[PDB]
């Protein structure tokens, strides 16, 4: 079998980091994870980038005797990891249904004979053709599940092939598991641990704050002209412009090229050699801009992308966070610019509400609502993101469009106490609409049947508009005082941070709600 490379495991982690991978020091959370994995304890890793993430299982794999198995759905990216690893002297291979059976059998023979240390496998392949019975004889020492949020229906990218990964724990009870992801909120993180059967795992959630990325929004008004001007104002800085159609990509690349800008189109309709060339030309800074569909995702992630534009709003914050997160991997100042029109959200809502009714549509609706609320926020954009992912923070960043031009404020302490009290009084079971009706004292049969018309809070906000109360509550959500529980039909629920305001111990400044 693949042999451990270092005598002392504790000192080995840093030795391999530096000597094999060339990194001088660990990033936050990495050492902890790696030492925990080397101790044989299950782990869930929520990390800012794939880069720090992958070393969380590659370093352990080099310090252990045995085979490390890495499950990933990214076939054309898994194959790239292998080449890069092999170039660093690491015995890596991959197995998936796209390979010929001849090639698959060679990889299986490499694992059987102990010539392969690290095997990347597609989830479908791992659970097919009695592969697990073969895997049991190959001295498995660690099983890592990448893109682990894909096992959850509460996430933004559920994959049916991940569901069967819940059978691994039972089949390999003494095999330590790790689950890894860059984008999972609280509900999704909890679901990952439950579905994979992680045994009291170390849960390492790194910060979602990328302090060097400035987040901005521009309301659309002749948006093709706004986009060209934005690009002109970058004055040569590199960028990715994300569009939701191939024609937008192609037309946008042509208009930029017409103005002397070094830009290329990138989408799944290009040939593989053309895709690789565009990626390489962008990596080396031969190209200033790549205009792309969501296909030009992570994977290339040049460290020095200066800006990411979203011409069209994404369907969920998870996607928006992942895509904007491709900017400024080097830590130098970077910007994310989203062009928005409320008619864009109206269209997405239309598309969604005629899809099949039920649980799946509810999940999509919840995440779409939150994306629209981010766009229409009156609170620091960074706080919206951080609190969406459950990273409690109330201090404004000073580095987003809202922080650069804060809305007029008012003392919202009384309004916040009314909203927070209402949420508590209705036992945190109801969504935004119902709560606002209770506050405004509406004539509603449902309210009377629950007896909520007898509450003291009932009608305490009747003198302020529906949109006023929606804004108050949305700002409380964006500040992390209130959450929307996706597993309870988006019920409004209270956090620990709500306590001082609810008690009247602290004052709360809020944005005066926009008239709209
Ligand atoms: Mn250590
Ligand atoms: Zn801010």
Swiss-Prot record:
Requires Mg(2+) for helicase activity on dsDNA and G-quadruplex DNA; Mn(2+) and Ca(2+) also support unwinding. The keyword Manganese applies. It catalyses: Couples ATP hydrolysis with the unwinding of duplex DNA by translocating in the 3'-5' direction; ATP + H2O = ADP + phosphate + H(+). Optimum temperature is 50 degrees Celsius, able to efficiently unwind Holliday junction DNA at 55 degrees Celsius. It comes from the Bacteria. Residues 223-371 form the Helicase C-terminal domain. One of its GO terms (biological process) is DNA damage response. Its EC number is 5.6.2.4. It is an enzyme of class 5 (isomerase). Helicase activity on dsDNA is inhibited by ATP-gamma-S. Helicase activity on dsDNA is inhibited by porphyrin derivative meso-tetra (N-methyl-4-pyridyl) porphine tetra tosylate (T4) at 20 uM but not inhibited by N-methyl mesoporphyrin IX (NMM). Helicase activity on G-quadruplex DNA is inhibited by porphyrin derivatives T4 (2 uM) and NMM (0.2 uM) but not by ATP-gamma-S. Zn(2+) binds at residues 380, 397, 400, 403. Disruption phenotype: Increased sensitivity to UV light and recombination deficient in a recBC sbeB background, partially resistant to thymineless death. Increased genetic instability of G-quadruplex DNA; a double recG-recQ deletion shows 10-fold increased genetic instability. Mn(2+) binds at residues 10, 31, 35. Belongs to the helicase family. RecQ subfamily. An ATP-dependent DNA helicase which unwinds DNA in a 3'-5' direction. ATPase activity is stimulated by single-stranded (ss)DNA but only very poorly by double-stranded (ds)DNA. Binds to and unwinds a wide variety of substrates including 3- and 4-way junctions (including Holliday junctions, HJ), flayed duplexes, 5'- and 3'-overhangs and blunt end duplexes. HJ DNA unwinding is stimulated by single-stranded binding protein (SSB). Unwinds G-quadruplex DNA. Unlike yeast SGS1 or human BLM, is equally active on dsDNA versus G-quadruplex substrates. This is ATP-dependent DNA helicase RecQ. It comes from Escherichia coli (strain K12). The lineage of its organism: Bacteria, Pseudomonadati, Pseudomonadota, Gammaproteobacteria, Enterobacterales.
